Amino acid sequence: VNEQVQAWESRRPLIQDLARRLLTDDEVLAVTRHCSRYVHEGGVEDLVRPLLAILDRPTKLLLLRDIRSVVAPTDLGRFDSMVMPVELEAFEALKSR
Ligand SMILES: C[C@H](CO)OC[C@@H](C)OC[C@H](C)OC[C@@H](C)O
C-alpha cells in the first residue's frame, strides 16, 4: 500500500487535472475513488474493469499512463493483460477514422 499510496499521492494532481479535462466531475470522482481504493486495499482487476468502462475513447485512455505508475509490481502483469489489448483497439479506432 505505502509505496503505491505514495505514488498515488504524488501523481493525483496530474491524474485529477487531466481527468477533469476529459471527463465529467462525477467521472473524475469515480476515477479518484477507484485509484484510492486500489492503492490502499489492492485488487488490480477491480481498478481496471471500471476504468475501462469510463475511459471509453482513445484520448481518455491517456489517464492509464499515470495510473500504471501506482500499480504494485506484482500487479503489473495483470494490469497489462487487461489494458494492452484496449490500447491496441484504441489505435485502430484512431486509424479507421
Ligand atoms: C493508452 C495510453 C496511450 O496510448 O497508454 C496506456 C498506458 C498503459 O501507458 C502505457 C505505459 C505506461 O507507457 C508506455 C510507454 C512509456 O512506452
Give residue 60's domain range.
Answer: 2-95
Resolution value (Å, 1 decimal): 1.5
Where is the chain discontinuous (C–N over 2.5 Å), named by the preceding residue?
none
> Of ligand 1's atoms, which has the minimum distance to the CA of residue 91?
4
Cell numbers found for residue 79: 494490469
Distance from C-alpha of 87 to C-alpha of 90, rounded to nearest angstrom:
5
Q: Are 68 and 56 in contact (CB under 8 A)?
A: no
Q: Is 24 exposed, middle or buried (0-12, 13-18, 19+ CB in 10 A)?
A: exposed
Query: Phi/psi of residue 24, each to 5°?
Result: -75, 160
Residue 66: which of 6, 8, 5, 1 has the closest Cα? 8
Tell me how far CA of residue 56 lies from CA of 4, 52, 73, in angstroms. 25, 7, 26
Method underlying the structure: X-ray
Distance from C-alpha of 7 to C-alpha of 70, rounded to nearest angstrom:
5
Q: Is the dihedral of CA 62, 5, 69, 77 positive or negative?
A: negative
Please choose from 87, 91, 94 the residue to mutate so as to test ligand 1's pocket, defined by most ligand atoms within 8 A of CB: 87
User: What one-letter code names the amino acid at 7?
Assistant: A
Q: Which residues have C-beta within 8 Å of that of residue 3, sequence separation ≥ 6?
A: 72
Question: Domain count of the chain?
Answer: 1
